[PDB]
Design a protein around this ligand. Structure first.
Ligand SMILES: [Cl-]
Ligand SMILES: [Cl-]
Length: 162
């Protein structure tokens, strides 16, 4: 198990524009297109993203390309962020993957905002951190995905994904 396999499970794979769980236009493997209620605006973003006139449909290869770019952006976002970086550095390879998963899903600014859990994280207060992350919109909105990431963070094992 690695960060790629982890997110592939969490996000799934769709070759056609779709709406995330919050109503947003998405494609491939969890790649947000726009937060705009316009399908045309989504087909626009997609073509700009892909380099061509997709008529809203991409190939597996094209989805993997976006995915590669998105994991890379998540990792660089973490390392460049003053709040995220030290948490990251302080952790083990498994727990690190869980942070990257949260950043990919919620953006660097969003995760950076979890002040209290980042501190519990850094201090290794595992159980308490799991209880706190559960108290969130994120968990309430996507509970099954949240439980797996939170468990990964909590235990440092890939159990939830096996
Ligand atoms: Cl992009
Ligand atoms: Cl879910």
């Amino acid at each position: 198990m690695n960060i790629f396999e982890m997110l592939r499970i969490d996000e799934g794979l769709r070759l056609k524009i779709y709406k995330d769980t919050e109503g947003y236009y998405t494609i491939g493997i969890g790649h947000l297109l726009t937060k705009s209620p316009s399908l045309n605006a989504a087909k626009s973003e997609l073509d700009k993203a892909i380099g061509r006139n997709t008529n809203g449909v991409i190939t597996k290869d094209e989805a993997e390309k976006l995915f590669n770019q998105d994991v890379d952006a998540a990792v660089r976002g973490i390392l460049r962020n003053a709040k995220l970086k030290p948490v990251y550095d302080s952790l083990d390879a498994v727990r690190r993957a869980a942070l990257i998963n949260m950043v990919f899903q919620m953006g660097e600014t969003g995760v950076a905002g979890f002040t209290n859990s980042l501190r519990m994280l850094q201090q290794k207060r595992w159980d308490e951190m799991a209880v706190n992350l559960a108290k969130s919109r994120w968990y309430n909105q996507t509970p099954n995905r949240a439980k797996r990431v939170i468990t990964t963070a909590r235990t440092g094992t890939w159990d939830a994904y096996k």
